[PDB]
Design an enzyme around this catalytic site. Sequence first.
Site, PDB file in Angstrom:
ATOM      1  N   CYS A 171      41.615 -13.921 -96.793  1.00  0.00           N
ATOM      2  CA  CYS A 171      42.782 -14.811 -96.841  1.00  0.00           C
ATOM      3  C   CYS A 171      43.865 -14.311 -97.812  1.00  0.00           C
ATOM      4  O   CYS A 171      43.648 -14.288 -99.028  1.00  0.00           O
ATOM      5  CB  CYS A 171      42.331 -16.215 -97.234  1.00  0.00           C
ATOM      6  SG  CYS A 171      43.652 -17.387 -97.465  1.00  0.00           S
ATOM      7  N   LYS A 229      33.913 -25.927 -91.918  1.00  0.00           N
ATOM      8  CA  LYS A 229      34.203 -26.354 -93.287  1.00  0.00           C
ATOM      9  C   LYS A 229      33.246 -27.402 -93.873  1.00  0.00           C
ATOM     10  O   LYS A 229      32.877 -28.366 -93.207  1.00  0.00           O
ATOM     11  CB  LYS A 229      35.637 -26.880 -93.392  1.00  0.00           C
ATOM     12  CG  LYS A 229      36.697 -25.848 -93.117  1.00  0.00           C
ATOM     13  CD  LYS A 229      38.085 -26.440 -93.306  1.00  0.00           C
ATOM     14  CE  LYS A 229      39.142 -25.484 -92.777  1.00  0.00           C
ATOM     15  NZ  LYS A 229      40.462 -26.122 -92.728  1.00  0.00           N
ATOM     16  N   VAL A 238      42.400 -22.929 -98.290  1.00  0.00           N
ATOM     17  CA  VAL A 238      42.243 -22.086 -99.474  1.00  0.00           C
ATOM     18  C   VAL A 238      43.547 -21.331 -99.714  1.00  0.00           C
ATOM     19  O   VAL A 238      44.303 -21.093 -98.772  1.00  0.00           O
ATOM     20  CB  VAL A 238      41.059 -21.079 -99.381  1.00  0.00           C
ATOM     21  CG1 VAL A 238      39.740 -21.806 -99.513  1.00  0.00           C
ATOM     22  CG2 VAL A 238      41.117 -20.248 -98.086  1.00  0.00           C
ATOM     23  N   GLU A 284      47.787 -24.864-103.005  1.00  0.00           N
ATOM     24  CA  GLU A 284      48.986 -24.030-102.763  1.00  0.00           C
ATOM     25  C   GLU A 284      48.960 -22.767-103.634  1.00  0.00           C
ATOM     26  O   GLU A 284      49.063 -22.825-104.877  1.00  0.00           O
ATOM     27  CB  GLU A 284      50.301 -24.793-102.925  1.00  0.00           C
ATOM     28  CG  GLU A 284      50.537 -25.871-101.864  1.00  0.00           C
ATOM     29  CD  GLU A 284      50.423 -25.337-100.432  1.00  0.00           C
ATOM     30  OE1 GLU A 284      49.748 -25.985 -99.609  1.00  0.00           O
ATOM     31  OE2 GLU A 284      50.998 -24.265-100.145  1.00  0.00           O
ATOM     32  N   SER A 285      48.805 -21.626-102.970  1.00  0.00           N
ATOM     33  CA  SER A 285      48.667 -20.356-103.668  1.00  0.00           C
ATOM     34  C   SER A 285      49.713 -20.114-104.771  1.00  0.00           C
ATOM     35  O   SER A 285      49.365 -19.649-105.848  1.00  0.00           O
ATOM     36  CB  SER A 285      48.651 -19.191-102.670  1.00  0.00           C
ATOM     37  OG  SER A 285      49.774 -19.239-101.818  1.00  0.00           O
TER      38      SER A 285
HETATM   39  N1  LIG Z   1      50.656 -22.697 -98.010  1.00  0.00           N
HETATM   40  C1  LIG Z   1      49.256 -22.416 -98.251  1.00  0.00           C
HETATM   41  C2  LIG Z   1      48.659 -21.698 -97.033  1.00  0.00           C
HETATM   42  C3  LIG Z   1      47.178 -21.434 -97.293  1.00  0.00           C
HETATM   43  C4  LIG Z   1      46.429 -21.051 -96.019  1.00  0.00           C
HETATM   44  O1  LIG Z   1      46.946 -21.123 -94.961  1.00  0.00           O
HETATM   45  N2  LIG Z   1      45.057 -20.585 -96.100  1.00  0.00           N
HETATM   46  C5  LIG Z   1      44.332 -20.521 -94.852  1.00  0.00           C
HETATM   47  C6  LIG Z   1      43.532 -19.220 -94.893  1.00  0.00           C
HETATM   48  S1  LIG Z   1      44.585 -17.783 -95.242  1.00  0.00           S
HETATM   49  C7  LIG Z   1      43.439 -21.737 -94.614  1.00  0.00           C
HETATM   50  O2  LIG Z   1      42.854 -22.258 -95.519  1.00  0.00           O
HETATM   51  N3  LIG Z   1      43.153 -22.060 -93.229  1.00  0.00           N
HETATM   52  C8  LIG Z   1      42.081 -22.936 -92.813  1.00  0.00           C
HETATM   53  C9  LIG Z   1      42.691 -23.779 -91.705  1.00  0.00           C
HETATM   54  O3  LIG Z   1      43.833 -23.612 -91.437  1.00  0.00           O
HETATM   55  O4  LIG Z   1      42.042 -24.596 -91.136  1.00  0.00           O
HETATM   56  C10 LIG Z   1      49.120 -21.536 -99.509  1.00  0.00           C
HETATM   57  O5  LIG Z   1      50.068 -20.993 -99.963  1.00  0.00           O
HETATM   58  O6  LIG Z   1      48.142 -21.601-100.165  1.00  0.00           O
END
Ligand SMILES: N[C@@H](CCC(=O)N[C@@H](CS)C(=O)NCC(=O)O)C(=O)O
Lengths: 236, 236
Positions: A28, A55, A68, A81-82
């Site tokens: 990720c 999950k 995540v 939020e990263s």
């Molecule tokens: N805006 C969020 C995006 C985070 C994100 O999209 N992570 C993905 C993996 S890269 C996630 O957890 N996806 C699981 C899902 O969408 O169900 C960030 O900046 O943290």
Amino acid sequence: SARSLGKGSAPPGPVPEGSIRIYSMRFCPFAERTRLVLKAKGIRHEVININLKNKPEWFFKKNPFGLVPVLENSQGQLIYESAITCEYLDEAYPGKKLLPDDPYEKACQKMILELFSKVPSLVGSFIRSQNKEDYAGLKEEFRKEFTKLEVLTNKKTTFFGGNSISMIDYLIWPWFERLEAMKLNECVDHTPKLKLWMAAMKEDPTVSALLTSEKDWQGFLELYLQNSPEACDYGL
Amino acid sequence: SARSLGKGSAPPGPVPEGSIRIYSMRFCPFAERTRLVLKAKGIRHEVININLKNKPEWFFKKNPFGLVPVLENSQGQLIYESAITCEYLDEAYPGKKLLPDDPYEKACQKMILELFSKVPSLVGSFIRSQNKEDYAGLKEEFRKEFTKLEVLTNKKTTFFGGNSISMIDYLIWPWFERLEAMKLNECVDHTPKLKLWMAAMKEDPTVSALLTSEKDWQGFLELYLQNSPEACDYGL
Ligand SMILES: N[C@@H](CCC(=O)N[C@@H](CS)C(=O)NCC(=O)O)C(=O)O
Ligand SMILES: N[C@@H](CCC(=O)N[C@@H](CS)C(=O)NCC(=O)O)C(=O)O
């Protein structure tokens, strides 16, 4: 045993004094942001990987969004939020500051981040696109966005925030790492500075330390495309 | 003469020592964010309104995105994106800090902002929607998003960052101001805390000082809907 946690898994215990915990997934790029900052700052931490297809029910208690990365500190506080997680780590931990002290430079770095903001979606939509059509247009899109970074940022230094690597570089890196892995380096053939920046980035000890190998990326990718729950755990 | 600048207008001179300048539009809630912060901090500044239908060509030199708000300081530096501009103002100017010193509270405020993030689009898409259909669904959407703020933030204090008004409140306010103006208060009838928060917000001297009257909002709105260039300048 960095194997991801999924449905049915025990809710994890409290994060121990002296540590911070990251809820992550190995492939990720958003979570890579956080892990880059953790490493650069030499922060003692735990990783718990989350199976994103399957999950753990308790995970929505960590982040209502169910995404995540998420940080959980030993005071039981939760951050998601990263970008927010990276900024928090830089503020809350000692050592090299990744954000500049100065308010304008801080602002300029966020403005750069905003210039980069279309890229992550383009990358996802490339991986997940199977028509010759959508490749052509997505390529054009890559070009357009990369010139934005090249032309609008008007970098005159090795890195985006100056002569040394800093928050902004680590924030955008994961998608350039992915670009290479997707054999798309030629999308930056018209952007000389960005191209040089990628080479400089790979020499950085932290970037270097967190690179995912061609093997592992491809392994994840194959299983991701088969919508397999085991994708998260490729390479063991 | 707060009349907006449009195509053909002279590029403005340099921002004077002792001031900061905001490129704005009187009925722009994103720019309202910035103006709220300017007022709360007692910051000496200039306003130049930009005609958004008939934009001055020189304005894309201020912000490649061609959007308001933009800050220009007397050192000739340029800052765009409303959130970035507010954070910069708070950092770069003396007086009451609108962001808390503590890294977690800072992070929590950004997490709240992220919870609110769907609202601005819903508001725009309401103004710009003419089918009975789209009103019903948009209403449902309002409800959903407002409970997110109500339920997920779990406010226990008068304001979103504690017992006193702070950055997060000023960041979200403009759209709640607009909600009222659009006679949509009933969208927060199921969210008791949010509802009380709105009343407390209107008592704040800065919020109070920047409210747009029913007259002026409606005047802008009429001309906006006719896609008229004079919309920006309603009420003179
Ligand atoms: N805006 C969020 C995006 C985070 C994100 O999209 N992570 C993905 C993996 S890269 C996630 O957890 N996806 C699981 C899902 O969408 O169900 C960030 O900046 O943290
Ligand atoms: N993300 C931007 C959005 C700013 C924005 O959309 N401002 C509008 C007026 S409220 C704009 O300048 N529109 C002119 C146009 O879209 O052409 C912010 O936070 O500042």
